[PDB]
Amino acid sequence: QLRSWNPPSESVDAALLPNFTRGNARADDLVRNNGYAANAIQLHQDHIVGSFFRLSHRPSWRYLGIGEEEARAFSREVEAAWKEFAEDDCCCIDVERKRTFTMMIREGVAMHAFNGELFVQATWDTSSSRLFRTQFRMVSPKRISNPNNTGDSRNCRAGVQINDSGAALGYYVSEDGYPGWMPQKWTWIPRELPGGRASFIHVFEPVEDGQTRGANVFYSVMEQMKMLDTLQNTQLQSAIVKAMYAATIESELDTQSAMDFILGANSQEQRERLTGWIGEIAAYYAAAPVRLGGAKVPHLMPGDSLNLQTAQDTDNGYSVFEQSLLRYIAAGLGVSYEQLSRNYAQMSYSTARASANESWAYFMGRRKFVASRQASQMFLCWLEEAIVRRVVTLPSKARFSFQEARSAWGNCDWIGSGRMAIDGLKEVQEAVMLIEAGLSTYEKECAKRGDDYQEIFAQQVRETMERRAAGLKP
Template identity: 25%
Template sequence: MALDGLRQRLGALLGGFDAAQAHRRLRGFRASRAHVNTLIAGAGDTITARARWLARNNGYAANAVEAFASNVVGDGIKPSSSITDAALKEELQALWLAWTDEADAEGLTDFYGLQRRAAREVFLSGEVFFRLRPRRPEDGLSVPLQLQMLPAEMLPLDLTRELPGGGLIRQGIEFNRIGRRVAYHLLRRHPGDSTDPGLVGETVRVPAADIIHVMDPVEAGQLRGVSRFAPSIVKLFTLDLYDDAELERKKTAAMFAMFITSPAPETPLDPAEEDLEVEPGQVVRLDPGEDVSTPATPDSGSTYEPFQYRTLLQISAALGVPYGYLTGDTAKGNFSNTRIALVDFRRRVSAFQHSVIVYQLCRAVWARWMDVAVLSGALGIADYEKQRRHYQACAWLPTKWDWVDPMKDASAEILQIEAGLKSRTQALSERGYDADQVDREIAAERDRELALGLDFRRPGSPAQGPASKGDKGQSDHEPGGGSEDDGSTSEETT
């Protein structure tokens, strides 16, 4: 404390940075100097519990989680092997596709569903764990491997101690003497699941090679994840209370209670023989001297909606989700500013896709899956051990985002391809498709159409080459026709 006071006095003497001063405006600003690991160890469980509560009970929070997960994963971030042998690549991709339906150890979804659940968990609790579960050949899987998804609560934050030999456990993660992760000490049962008969607090040591830890660190040296709801929990909860109070006030106002006062009742202590009931359109005659009054219930006024809007904008910024995605309100913006917000959001999502979901989850699963597939004999590659990195090379293709006007976007993309600014392979990859597979499908369709005497391509489209036009009997002067040297090309651009 004495050192902090000396620093403050020195800062006040030197001046320069107003943000470091201790004057009246910043007198109550007590910023903690604790490392993020210390903060998460003390508050991580509470933040995660409150985030989960909001996602279950608050419509805005639930909408934000689903919007984030659906934009990050969509139909799935899918692999495209870089193997040049077309037959081997086709066999590999077919085996992977068959295994994706068997990937979930719980049997509730496929591998791409696990990706979506992982995105939800990282948004809610800041992290999620996958345990790689080898299976027996008699289990009948295409590749004897499955993934068990474990929530953040399964790794205790308060498990920290030193180990013999120079190792230590920090927040449930075991490190060796050089700081490398060697194991995770996971709970056998969820600490909040009373339906599981397992022992409370009992842990099991799992080697780090069998655990995939998916998290999006916000500070250097961070060990555990923190919920994306952390900056918005207070505002979401208090806004919810405010909305409930407004609804109750409206409900009370709708009851329309009346009070009858009499200046000189004959029997003031006796209750009235019957209550006065008023129906719509009824004319009520009162006794002389009696008066009827109704309680004044204030209206929401003109400040309710602007206050809601500004508060939800702050929550939207804290969550990193556009206002329209958070609220479902599309009336607040026009096409241009909505698209600007979406472009920024999708850049953030793209960064999260490749730096978190692909790098931490997809690549790790792909590497282990190929190892197990080769070792089990499901995939035959003679020199796999010598060229393991070569065979595991792979591109991961997210689902393409759709815009409000897809025709303009498609036309612009065709112009870029024709101008040589991008390739068809790049365009197909951006749409989440493998170019080799698409080309094989197109070639098969062309052969089938030729055999049946069909051609569904638009006349004059770049996909129609001179040979195809000749098959249809078009002359060089007919619409859509052209000579071989008029600059047209047979290269497909769709």
């Protein structure tokens, strides 16, 4: 079985890139034919981004000498601008003109999960319906190959032109293949502009040094493919052969030496004996009507029957095989099957909350690992455009210029899915302890709750004043 799937013995990058197309193609096959990939990407979406992905700008006020109040007001301005620019209802923020920021993050994270890499391009849109002429078009991974599909070279390696030190200079984007009859032409695309401008945002997780591509799926999913095939076929055979039945006719006849002599005489010159016996047996079956049930017994003149003696008859064991292996690959691939297909077998209280909190912290890990890159890159490009357009005003006491301290000025964090609910009592006792001991700040409280302290305080002011005015109890 190791024949149809073969690992070379070498560093992972040189063991994957030669068989990149086959592994990725069979990955496409399984993610299309199989529901597990859809469920996994959907849960990753709903744990990492969830409803939305919220920007929070925190310029390094302490290091830059900027006042915290000026930083906070400038952040208010940039947050209002960014939310109003992102909430465009006409899907107009993409060059394809059919994806908002939500689906920017969606397709980016999905493709960085599947192929391990995502490709964003900051292009200059001309549609004047918005103040900001920068859109972000996502680039397929099929596009990145060496110019004219040539094999890897000295410095042109699977489509990326690098130096001897590996520094990613640029890329050869092959032309799109949709419809299925466009030819591919390779075009030069630099990774970033010299001034720090993020033109081609290439975010991938390298497992080792010098690696150019991300992680796969199929190269650990062939075994589900062939287990589902084998369980499927074995259930089919079991079902079809629980009551397969042979309906033949035998007789006494069979006078050993006499039967053999009759057969030999028929073979030599006395076939009339066989013809007469066949006629008698045909008359037998047409005067009997030899019929078993609703159907006719298949015509068998005496002396021939099937021997449907069977193989071993122990239990198939597939039960504990499949539970063990589903277990196995479930906290292999990472998301547990007791919800990837939802068993409720013997699961208990500590079971539930321990599994939930470890899995949720681990999704927080993946979120902070493979979402903040895209978030910061897009925010940096948008903030550069805003500074170009003088939408928001930089602090006058800027210790470093915007172009010099884009990292310092464009320092930001992002908020993923909403408020976690698992037990209730858990979150509420945590909340009461934090609010009584002061062990929670504005920033981490809002991180835990998916809200904002400024708005909760303003709305509590509104709550109290409306209760006082209408006669309610604050």
